[PDB]
Short mmCIF file of C-alpha atoms in Angstrom, two decimals:
data_model
loop_
_atom_site.label_atom_id
_atom_site.label_comp_id
_atom_site.label_asym_id
_atom_site.label_seq_id
_atom_site.Cartn_x
_atom_site.Cartn_y
_atom_site.Cartn_z
CA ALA N 1 -17.90 -5.11 28.36
CA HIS N 2 -19.37 -1.63 27.95
CA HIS N 3 -22.43 0.59 28.28
CA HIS N 4 -22.10 2.53 25.00
CA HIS N 5 -24.93 0.60 23.34
CA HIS N 6 -27.55 3.24 24.18
CA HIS N 7 -25.51 5.73 22.12
CA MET N 8 -25.51 3.72 18.89
CA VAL N 9 -25.90 5.71 15.67
CA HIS N 10 -26.85 4.62 12.15
CA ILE N 11 -23.86 5.36 9.93
CA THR N 12 -23.96 5.53 6.15
CA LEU N 13 -21.04 5.93 3.72
CA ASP N 14 -20.32 9.26 1.99
CA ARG N 15 -20.02 8.48 -1.73
CA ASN N 16 -18.29 11.84 -2.38
CA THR N 17 -15.32 10.85 -0.15
CA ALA N 18 -14.93 7.30 -1.45
CA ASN N 19 -11.87 6.32 -3.45
CA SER N 20 -12.81 5.87 -7.13
CA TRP N 21 -12.16 2.10 -7.01
CA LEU N 22 -14.61 1.45 -4.16
CA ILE N 23 -17.93 -0.35 -4.64
CA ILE N 24 -20.54 0.80 -2.10
CA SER N 25 -23.85 -1.06 -1.61
CA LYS N 26 -27.19 0.57 -2.47
CA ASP N 27 -28.03 1.29 1.17
CA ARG N 28 -24.49 2.75 1.66
CA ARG N 29 -23.87 0.34 4.58
CA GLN N 30 -21.27 -1.94 2.92
CA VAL N 31 -18.08 -1.25 0.96
CA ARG N 32 -15.54 -3.36 -0.94
CA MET N 33 -12.50 -2.81 -3.15
CA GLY N 34 -13.28 -3.13 -6.88
CA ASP N 35 -11.14 -4.06 -9.89
CA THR N 36 -11.54 -0.88 -11.97
CA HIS N 37 -11.68 2.93 -11.72
CA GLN N 38 -15.45 3.37 -11.27
CA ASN N 39 -16.67 6.49 -13.22
CA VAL N 40 -16.96 9.17 -10.47
CA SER N 41 -16.62 12.98 -10.71
CA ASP N 42 -13.54 14.80 -9.42
CA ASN N 43 -13.84 16.54 -6.06
CA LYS N 44 -11.55 17.78 -3.27
CA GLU N 45 -13.21 15.49 -0.66
CA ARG N 46 -12.33 12.21 -2.36
CA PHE N 47 -9.48 10.02 -1.05
CA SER N 48 -7.10 9.47 -3.95
CA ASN N 49 -4.30 7.11 -2.77
CA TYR N 50 -6.01 4.54 -0.49
CA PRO N 51 -9.29 2.51 -0.42
CA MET N 52 -10.73 4.94 2.12
CA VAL N 53 -14.21 6.39 2.64
CA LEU N 54 -15.89 8.42 5.42
CA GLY N 55 -19.26 8.16 7.09
CA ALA N 56 -21.69 10.82 5.93
CA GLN N 57 -22.38 11.83 9.55
CA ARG N 58 -20.53 14.79 11.15
CA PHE N 59 -20.11 14.98 14.94
CA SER N 60 -19.27 18.14 16.87
CA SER N 61 -20.74 17.06 20.21
CA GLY N 62 -22.09 14.09 22.15
CA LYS N 63 -21.49 10.36 22.54
CA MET N 64 -21.62 8.12 19.46
CA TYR N 65 -21.23 4.36 18.97
CA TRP N 66 -21.18 2.19 15.87
CA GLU N 67 -20.19 -1.30 14.76
CA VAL N 68 -18.19 -2.60 11.81
CA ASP N 69 -18.00 -6.11 10.42
CA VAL N 70 -14.49 -7.21 9.38
CA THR N 71 -15.18 -10.97 8.92
CA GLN N 72 -12.65 -12.77 6.69
CA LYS N 73 -10.61 -9.59 6.06
CA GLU N 74 -6.80 -9.66 6.20
CA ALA N 75 -6.36 -5.87 6.26
CA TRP N 76 -8.34 -2.81 7.25
CA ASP N 77 -8.01 0.52 9.09
CA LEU N 78 -10.96 1.80 11.21
CA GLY N 79 -11.85 4.67 13.46
CA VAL N 80 -12.71 8.35 13.29
CA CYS N 81 -11.03 11.40 11.80
CA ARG N 82 -11.28 15.19 11.53
CA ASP N 83 -13.29 16.53 8.63
CA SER N 84 -10.17 18.59 7.89
CA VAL N 85 -7.93 15.56 7.16
CA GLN N 86 -5.85 15.53 3.97
CA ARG N 87 -7.64 13.65 1.13
CA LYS N 88 -5.04 13.77 -1.67
CA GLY N 89 -1.67 12.05 -1.92
CA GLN N 90 0.28 10.08 0.68
CA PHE N 91 -0.10 10.52 4.42
CA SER N 92 0.24 8.52 7.65
CA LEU N 93 -2.66 7.67 9.94
CA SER N 94 -1.84 9.44 13.23
CA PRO N 95 -3.51 11.77 15.77
CA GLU N 96 -1.24 14.63 14.53
CA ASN N 97 -2.75 14.12 11.08
CA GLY N 98 -6.28 14.02 12.59
CA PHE N 99 -6.88 10.25 12.70
CA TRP N 100 -7.80 8.06 15.69
CA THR N 101 -7.65 4.54 14.33
CA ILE N 102 -6.78 0.91 14.80
CA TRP N 103 -5.86 -1.60 12.13
CA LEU N 104 -5.15 -5.13 11.12
CA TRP N 105 -1.98 -5.45 9.04
CA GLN N 106 -0.13 -8.73 8.33
CA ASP N 107 -1.61 -10.66 11.29
CA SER N 108 -0.90 -7.85 13.74
CA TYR N 109 -3.41 -5.52 15.39
CA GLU N 110 -2.13 -2.00 15.95
CA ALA N 111 -3.31 1.27 17.44
CA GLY N 112 -2.57 4.25 15.19
CA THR N 113 -0.46 6.17 17.65
CA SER N 114 2.80 7.64 16.32
CA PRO N 115 4.66 5.34 16.17
CA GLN N 116 2.09 2.52 16.11
CA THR N 117 1.32 0.56 19.30
CA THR N 118 0.95 -3.21 18.88
CA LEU N 119 -2.23 -4.61 20.47
CA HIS N 120 -2.40 -8.10 21.95
CA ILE N 121 -5.77 -9.58 21.01
CA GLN N 122 -6.50 -13.14 22.12
CA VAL N 123 -9.61 -13.58 19.97
CA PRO N 124 -9.44 -12.17 16.40
CA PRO N 125 -12.43 -9.84 16.06
CA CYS N 126 -15.10 -10.38 13.43
CA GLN N 127 -16.89 -7.18 14.53
CA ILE N 128 -15.49 -3.96 16.03
CA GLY N 129 -17.32 -1.51 18.26
CA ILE N 130 -16.27 2.11 18.00
CA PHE N 131 -17.18 4.72 20.64
CA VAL N 132 -16.52 8.47 20.53
CA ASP N 133 -17.16 10.90 23.38
CA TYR N 134 -16.65 14.28 21.69
CA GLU N 135 -16.47 16.56 24.73
CA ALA N 136 -14.23 14.18 26.66
CA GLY N 137 -11.81 13.67 23.76
CA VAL N 138 -12.12 9.86 23.91
CA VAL N 139 -12.14 7.24 21.11
CA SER N 140 -12.52 3.60 22.21
CA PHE N 141 -12.51 0.29 20.33
CA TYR N 142 -14.16 -2.95 21.44
CA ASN N 143 -14.00 -6.57 20.38
CA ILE N 144 -17.68 -7.47 19.89
CA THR N 145 -16.71 -11.05 19.07
CA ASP N 146 -14.99 -11.44 22.47
CA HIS N 147 -17.35 -10.28 25.24
CA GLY N 148 -17.06 -6.61 24.19
CA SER N 149 -13.51 -6.66 25.52
CA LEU N 150 -11.59 -3.41 25.28
CA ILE N 151 -9.12 -3.26 22.39
CA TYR N 152 -7.80 0.31 22.81
CA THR N 153 -8.70 3.80 24.01
CA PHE N 154 -7.28 7.10 22.72
CA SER N 155 -7.55 9.81 25.41
CA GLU N 156 -6.99 13.60 25.44
CA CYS N 157 -7.79 13.65 21.71
CA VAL N 158 -7.66 17.00 19.92
CA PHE N 159 -10.71 16.80 17.72
CA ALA N 160 -10.43 20.50 16.70
CA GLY N 161 -13.72 20.54 14.77
CA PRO N 162 -16.21 18.10 13.26
CA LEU N 163 -15.47 14.36 13.27
CA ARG N 164 -16.25 11.77 10.59
CA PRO N 165 -16.42 7.97 10.86
CA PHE N 166 -13.37 6.62 8.96
CA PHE N 167 -12.93 3.39 6.96
CA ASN N 168 -10.19 1.77 4.90
CA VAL N 169 -11.14 -1.54 3.23
CA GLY N 170 -7.50 -2.09 2.24
CA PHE N 171 -5.95 -3.34 -0.99
CA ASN N 172 -5.77 -7.01 -1.98
CA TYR N 173 -2.29 -8.00 -3.30
CA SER N 174 -2.41 -11.50 -1.72
CA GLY N 175 -5.96 -12.29 -2.95
CA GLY N 176 -7.06 -12.77 0.65
CA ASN N 177 -8.63 -9.38 1.37
CA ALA N 178 -11.66 -9.23 -0.92
CA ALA N 179 -14.20 -9.20 1.93
CA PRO N 180 -16.19 -6.00 2.50
CA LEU N 181 -16.50 -3.72 5.48
CA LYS N 182 -20.11 -3.73 6.65
CA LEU N 183 -21.85 -1.47 9.14
CA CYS N 184 -23.70 -3.84 11.50
CA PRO N 185 -27.64 -3.51 11.42
CA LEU N 186 -28.44 -1.93 14.93
CA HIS F 1 24.50 -17.53 -15.23
CA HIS F 2 26.32 -16.15 -18.30
CA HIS F 3 25.10 -12.54 -18.45
CA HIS F 4 27.91 -10.96 -16.44
CA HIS F 5 29.64 -9.65 -19.56
CA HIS F 6 26.58 -7.46 -20.27
CA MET F 7 26.55 -5.68 -16.89
CA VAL F 8 25.59 -2.00 -16.90
CA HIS F 9 25.99 0.63 -14.22
CA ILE F 10 22.50 1.72 -13.22
CA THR F 11 21.67 4.88 -11.32
CA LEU F 12 18.33 6.06 -9.98
CA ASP F 13 16.37 8.86 -11.64
CA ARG F 14 15.33 11.28 -8.91
CA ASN F 15 12.59 12.90 -11.03
CA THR F 16 10.71 9.58 -11.35
CA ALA F 17 10.82 8.73 -7.63
CA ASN F 18 7.84 8.70 -5.29
CA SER F 19 8.19 11.88 -3.20
CA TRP F 20 8.75 10.01 0.08
CA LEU F 21 11.76 8.12 -1.31
CA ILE F 22 15.22 8.82 0.09
CA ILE F 23 17.82 8.32 -2.64
CA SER F 24 21.51 8.41 -1.69
CA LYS F 25 23.96 10.97 -3.06
CA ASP F 26 25.39 8.43 -5.53
CA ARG F 27 21.86 7.51 -6.69
CA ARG F 28 22.64 3.80 -6.10
CA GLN F 29 20.45 3.18 -3.03
CA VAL F 30 16.87 4.03 -2.12
CA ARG F 31 14.66 3.61 0.91
CA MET F 32 11.22 4.69 2.09
CA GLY F 33 11.14 7.86 4.24
CA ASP F 34 8.43 8.87 6.69
CA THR F 35 7.77 12.29 5.15
CA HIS F 36 7.83 14.03 1.77
CA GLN F 37 11.41 14.73 0.58
CA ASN F 38 11.06 18.32 -0.68
CA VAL F 39 10.85 17.37 -4.34
CA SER F 40 8.46 19.09 -6.75
CA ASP F 41 5.72 17.25 -8.55
CA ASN F 42 6.19 16.50 -12.24
CA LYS F 43 4.67 14.22 -14.89
CA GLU F 44 7.40 11.57 -14.49
CA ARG F 45 6.95 10.94 -10.77
CA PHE F 46 5.20 7.83 -9.48
CA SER F 47 2.41 9.14 -7.27
CA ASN F 48 0.76 6.09 -5.67
CA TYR F 49 3.59 3.62 -4.88
CA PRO F 50 7.20 3.84 -3.61
CA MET F 51 8.51 3.33 -7.18
CA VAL F 52 11.50 4.81 -9.00
CA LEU F 53 13.16 4.14 -12.37
CA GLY F 54 16.77 3.80 -13.39
CA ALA F 55 18.03 6.79 -15.40
CA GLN F 56 19.21 4.57 -18.23
CA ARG F 57 16.99 3.99 -21.30
CA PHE F 58 17.44 0.89 -23.49
CA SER F 59 16.11 0.28 -27.00
CA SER F 60 18.57 -2.42 -28.11
CA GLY F 61 21.17 -4.79 -26.77
CA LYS F 62 21.72 -7.09 -23.82
CA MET F 63 21.82 -5.53 -20.34
CA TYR F 64 22.34 -6.97 -16.87
CA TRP F 65 22.24 -5.42 -13.41
CA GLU F 66 22.04 -6.52 -9.79
CA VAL F 67 19.90 -5.42 -6.85
CA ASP F 68 20.42 -6.09 -3.15
CA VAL F 69 17.20 -6.97 -1.29
CA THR F 70 18.80 -8.13 1.96
CA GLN F 71 16.38 -8.10 4.91
CA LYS F 72 13.46 -6.63 2.95
CA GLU F 73 9.92 -7.90 3.60
CA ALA F 74 8.54 -6.56 0.32
CA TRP F 75 9.75 -5.26 -3.02
CA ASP F 76 8.94 -5.24 -6.73
CA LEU F 77 11.77 -5.36 -9.30
CA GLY F 78 12.29 -5.59 -13.04
CA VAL F 79 12.09 -3.46 -16.15
CA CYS F 80 9.33 -1.38 -17.70
CA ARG F 81 8.45 0.67 -20.72
CA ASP F 82 9.35 4.37 -20.56
CA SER F 83 5.69 4.89 -21.56
CA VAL F 84 4.18 3.30 -18.43
CA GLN F 85 1.64 5.39 -16.59
CA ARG F 86 3.02 7.20 -13.51
CA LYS F 87 -0.17 8.46 -11.83
CA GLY F 88 -2.98 6.73 -10.01
CA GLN F 89 -3.49 3.03 -9.44
CA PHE F 90 -2.36 0.22 -11.72
CA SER F 91 -1.27 -3.38 -11.75
CA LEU F 92 2.22 -4.55 -12.68
CA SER F 93 1.73 -6.70 -15.77
CA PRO F 94 3.11 -6.99 -19.31
CA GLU F 95 -0.14 -5.49 -20.63
CA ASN F 96 0.69 -2.35 -18.64
CA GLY F 97 4.35 -2.41 -19.81
CA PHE F 98 6.01 -4.05 -16.75
CA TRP F 99 8.13 -7.23 -16.64
CA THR F 100 8.65 -7.78 -12.93
CA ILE F 101 8.87 -10.20 -9.99
CA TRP F 102 8.12 -9.42 -6.36
CA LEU F 103 8.23 -10.50 -2.77
CA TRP F 104 4.85 -9.90 -1.09
CA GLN F 105 3.85 -11.40 2.29
CA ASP F 106 6.35 -14.24 2.22
CA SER F 107 5.53 -15.27 -1.33
CA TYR F 108 7.64 -14.68 -4.44
CA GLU F 109 5.61 -14.03 -7.58
CA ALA F 110 6.08 -13.13 -11.22
CA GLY F 111 4.10 -10.16 -12.49
CA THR F 112 2.03 -11.97 -15.07
CA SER F 113 -1.74 -11.53 -15.41
CA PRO F 114 -2.80 -13.29 -13.22
CA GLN F 115 0.39 -13.58 -11.08
CA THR F 116 2.54 -16.72 -11.36
CA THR F 117 4.00 -18.19 -8.19
CA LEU F 118 7.80 -18.75 -8.24
CA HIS F 119 9.80 -21.80 -7.02
CA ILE F 120 12.59 -20.23 -4.98
CA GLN F 121 14.37 -22.50 -2.49
CA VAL F 122 17.06 -20.09 -1.23
CA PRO F 123 15.54 -16.70 -0.31
CA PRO F 124 17.48 -14.18 -2.38
CA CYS F 125 19.59 -11.42 -0.93
CA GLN F 126 20.58 -10.23 -4.39
CA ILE F 127 18.66 -10.46 -7.67
CA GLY F 128 20.22 -10.29 -11.14
CA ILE F 129 18.04 -8.88 -13.97
CA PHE F 130 18.88 -9.56 -17.61
CA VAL F 131 17.15 -7.96 -20.61
CA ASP F 132 17.74 -8.96 -24.24
CA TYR F 133 15.88 -6.30 -26.23
CA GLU F 134 16.03 -7.93 -29.66
CA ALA F 135 15.16 -11.39 -28.27
CA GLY F 136 12.20 -10.07 -26.29
CA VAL F 137 13.48 -11.66 -23.05
CA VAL F 138 13.57 -10.53 -19.40
CA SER F 139 15.16 -13.02 -16.96
CA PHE F 140 15.70 -12.99 -13.19
CA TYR F 141 18.53 -14.75 -11.33
CA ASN F 142 19.13 -15.65 -7.72
CA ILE F 143 22.65 -14.37 -7.08
CA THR F 144 22.54 -15.83 -3.56
CA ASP F 145 21.95 -19.29 -5.05
CA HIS F 146 24.90 -19.30 -7.49
CA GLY F 147 22.92 -17.33 -10.09
CA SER F 148 20.09 -19.88 -10.48
CA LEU F 149 17.21 -18.92 -12.79
CA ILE F 150 14.11 -17.54 -11.07
CA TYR F 151 11.89 -16.51 -13.99
CA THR F 152 11.97 -15.75 -17.69
CA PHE F 153 9.46 -13.62 -19.59
CA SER F 154 9.75 -14.35 -23.30
CA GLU F 155 7.90 -13.06 -26.37
CA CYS F 156 8.00 -9.63 -24.68
CA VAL F 157 6.50 -6.79 -26.64
CA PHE F 158 8.78 -4.07 -25.39
CA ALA F 159 7.25 -1.54 -27.83
CA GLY F 160 9.89 1.12 -27.19
CA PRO F 161 12.53 2.23 -24.69
CA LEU F 162 12.92 0.33 -21.41
CA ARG F 163 13.86 1.54 -17.95
CA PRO F 164 15.07 -0.40 -14.91
CA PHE F 165 12.17 -0.52 -12.44
CA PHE F 166 12.18 -0.59 -8.61
CA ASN F 167 9.59 -0.56 -5.83
CA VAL F 168 10.87 -0.41 -2.24
CA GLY F 169 7.35 -1.03 -0.96
CA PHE F 170 5.51 0.76 1.85
CA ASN F 171 6.66 0.16 5.43
CA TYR F 172 3.40 -0.25 7.36
CA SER F 173 4.77 -3.12 9.52
CA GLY F 174 8.00 -1.36 10.58
CA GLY F 175 9.80 -4.40 9.16
CA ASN F 176 10.37 -3.19 5.59
CA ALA F 177 12.63 -0.18 6.13
CA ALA F 178 15.59 -1.81 4.35
CA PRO F 179 16.85 -0.12 1.16
CA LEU F 180 17.15 -1.44 -2.36
CA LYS F 181 20.79 -1.11 -3.47
CA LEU F 182 22.37 -1.41 -6.89
CA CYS F 183 25.29 -3.80 -6.38
CA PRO F 184 28.72 -2.50 -7.36
CA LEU F 185 30.14 -3.93 -10.59
#
């Protein structure tokens, strides 16, 4: 269990960074993958190749905590990234590329080290806690569903500028990944 | 099957290939790399998926070729219109100019809209692809299972030249690094 709760922040999704196929709720607290290219203007901030979107918030100092609902989802990537991350084309999620993430992919939980580190989770999470300590260079992930158990911590992170909450809802080739990512209500 | 007498020698068209694809010197094998492969962007190149086309173009006749899929966790294979879109996101369907089958997360499917599940008993290691342009037919055969029929698209509206089509798939799991190979004649 942890004591990051007193550092919780209210995250909203940045529509200008969202892949053109994403459908984001009115309050910008939920996101799902849609079935068509969804009428949005071209900009350099927008992720082009993956169902990714950033939180609107920028962090250059302090301790921040937020929670993400992943109930019923078969794939997702979650964490935090540099504002400077590549938006266009193909790229790997790694600290070198400015991403500190974990994911669910094909029934396996992984930390986004390079190469990936498989995580042994006894209770599949329905909700994920994400903690960032900017000055310390720490990004931690917690299994809210299972006693706030620790999933993984990145340490000695090179943030090298502002950080952004990071989300990938994932594609849905099997039909089993339609569920949204939701930011849990504080 | 009885399509062996229509076999053609297929080679891969480098200019069409996703930029992370590693294509052998003989242009008969392809696998997913972990970085860009120092190729320049062009209008032909698939941008969003690890796809590549055969260099050959067909507007008539009967053609057959074979692809090795040994070990691979995921792939898409078949034939497509030369006019298919190369950029952005799209589904593989006849409406979009693709006649394909795939292996995705332990299920074999045909690329209809919506997808049609296949009835494969023996997991293939090699797939034979037959196209009869005039007949409007694309058929898939399980070479591993004595050439048994997998799937036939008929009443195909080819609507112009066709290209062999390949997708090696991404390798997020670490378990899909295997190449696609064009089997020797």
